[PDB]
């Protein structure tokens, strides 16, 4: 399953 | 040895043509098992291997929501990077993400990955220690500082060492009929005269899985690497792969040439010749 979303770059 | 799980995200801005398009694909080794497309009529994570279809709605719905949120995060990152590089608002740009885990034969983590590219080149990557970042340019130093302050490396590490390893273990078990099965290449040498004095010897490897293979031509036992035309390993379309290696030889020298095939499905490497 995918990772929970990152902070914006 | 032995297995990997990887996700590949692609976000593409399309100025004046609405929101950027977000596509994700997920893989176990060389096998794609999921996809998501923000451009589809009803974007949702969809199964792409038979072995993932058994997952419940909580699985699909959780993943769909992650992709929709990631697509929004990528939209902001694309905006932020355009400013970092002082680029026009009209040009189309690409942000790619690739992450996942490699596990050894005992199912333990060997290496974690979390890498990013902007317009086809390295931007920032999580180091092997999963605690620090490598920025590829001054623009990426801006992102590095933001991610260091936001403790992003710990959030990535938590997934890579935990959940990533656990999902891979679950998928391997569910998909073992295909994932662990050796599919040896079917091999043969073809001969094609070019003139009355030269001919092509082409060594074929077909219907193999995994994709990893080595095909080499020797002449009297000497590697012909420089004189070998080697094509990229290609998908057959049935979850197997193909590859060939060709050499141009003077007529009469054919029997001095041997093709060497190395693949996991084969007990011992093969040595083959044109069998007229």
């Amino acid at each position: 399953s995918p990772i929970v979303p990152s902070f914006d770059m | 040895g032995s297995h990997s799980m990887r996700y590949f995200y692609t976000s593409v801005s399309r100025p004046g043509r609405g929101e950027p398009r977000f596509i994700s694909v997920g893989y176990v080794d060389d096998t794609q098992f999921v996809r998501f497309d923000s451009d589809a009529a009803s974007p949702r994570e969809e199964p792409r291997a038979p072995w993932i279809e058994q997952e419940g709605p909580e699985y699909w719905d959780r993943n769909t929501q992650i992709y929709k949120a990631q697509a929004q995060t990528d939209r902001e990152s694309l905006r932020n990077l355009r400013g970092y590089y002082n680029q026009s608002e009209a040009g189309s740009h690409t942000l790619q993400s690739m992450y996942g885990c490699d596990v050894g034969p005992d199912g333990r983590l060997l290496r974690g990955h979390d890498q990013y590219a902007y317009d086809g080149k390295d931007y920032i990557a999580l180091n092997e220690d999963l605690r620090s970042w490598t920025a590829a340019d001054t623009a990426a130093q801006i992102t590095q500082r933001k991610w260091e302050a936001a403790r992003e490396a710990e959030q990535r590490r938590a997934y890579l060492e935990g959940e990533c390893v656990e999902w891979l273990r679950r998928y391997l078990e569910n998909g073992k009929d295909k994932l662990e099965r050796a599919d040896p290449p079917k091999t043969h040498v073809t001969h094609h005269p070019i003139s009355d004095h030269e001919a092509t010897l082409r060594c074929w490897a077909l219907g193999f899985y995994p994709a990893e293979i080595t095909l080499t031509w020797q002449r009297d036992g000497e590697d012909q690497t420089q004189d070998t035309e080697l094509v990229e390993t290609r998908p057959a379309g049935d979850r197997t792969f193909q590859k060939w290696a060709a050499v141009v030889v003077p007529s009469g020298e054919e029997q001095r040439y041997t093709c060497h095939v190395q693949h996991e499905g084969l007990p011992k490497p093969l040595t083959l010749r044109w069998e007229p």
Partner: protein, 99 residues
């Protein structure tokens, strides 16, 4: 920044005249992702063509597989036609059953 597609045109199974098979066009090593791929039968576009989901390699270059069911014969010429921002004109690669 930009990378031109590598193109291979081939059949899923070894070709046999009059036996059902799959015609493949594998495009790889390209960047950016936007690409136009057609499978041709005697110069005309084949209507029922499917393609793989967009993926990329370790070097970030993209790859796709375009495919259709076909029955190879002696008289018919098959090919793949590709256009990408890196190509000045669409490139046609003919299907050669020996490749």
């Amino acid at each position: 920044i930009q990378r031109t597609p590598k193109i291979q045109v081939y059949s899923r199974h070894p070709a046999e005249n009059g036996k059902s098979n799959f015609l493949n066009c594998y495009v790889s090593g390209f960047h950016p992702s936007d690409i136009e791929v057609d499978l041709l039968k005697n110069g005309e576009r084949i209507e029922k063509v499917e393609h793989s989901d967009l993926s990329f390699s370790k070097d970030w270059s993209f790859y796709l597989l375009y495919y259709t069911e076909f029955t190879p014969t002696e008289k018919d010429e098959y090919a793949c036609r590709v256009n990408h921002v890196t190509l000045s004109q669409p490139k046609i690669v003919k299907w050669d059953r020996d490749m």
